[PDB]
From Swiss-Prot, chain B:
Leader sequence segment: none
Induction: Transcriptionally induced in the absence of sulfur, requires CysR for transcription. Part of the srpG-srpH-srpI operon. Present in when grown in sulfur-containing media, induced 7-fold after 48 hours of sulfur starvation (at protein level).
Section covered of the full-length record: 8 to 53 of 306
Name of this chain's protein: Type 2A encapsulin shell protein SrpI
Summary of the function given for this chain in its UniProt record: Shell component of a type 2A encapsulin nanocompartment. Expression in E.coli generates nanocompartments with an average diameter of 25 nm. They can be disassembled by treatment with 6M guanidine hydrochloride and reassembled with cargo. The nanocompartment is probably involved in sulfur metabolism. Probably allows passage of cysteine into its interior; during growth in light the physiological pH is 8-8.4, about 30-54% of free cysteine (charge -1) would be able to pass through the shell.
Length: 52, 46
């Protein structure tokens, strides 16, 4: 079933898309690296009334 | 008495055939059919 679309290439393409989404989520949320966990004391600000 | 055949045969290369498969047939039907390629595994006969 690889006409006119390469089946392996589509499976790999989609797989890499999902992995790139997971990579962005890890750059934000990872426990080892990850911006939301590597924030220094004094750089954490709180909203005065909830809304931004 | 001289050199014997069984002893002299230890120096000789035997001619080995490929393994003979007795269930091989000429498979005439495959050779007589016309073969149509189907590029994506689906053949719809309208």
């Amino acid at each position: 079933y690889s006409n006119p679309h390469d089946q392996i290439r589509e499976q790999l393409r989609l797989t890499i898309e999902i992995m790139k989404e997971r990579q962005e989520s890890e750059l934000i949320n990872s426990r080892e690296y990850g911006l939301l966990n590597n924030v220094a004391p004094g750089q954490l600000v709180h909203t005065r009334n909830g809304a931004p | 008495l001289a050199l014997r055949d069984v002893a002299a045969r230890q120096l000789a290369n035997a001619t080995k055939t490929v393994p003979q498969l007795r269930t091989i047939t000429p498979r005439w039907l495959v050779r007589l059919l016309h073969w149509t390629p189907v590029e994506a595994g689906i053949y719809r006969v309208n």
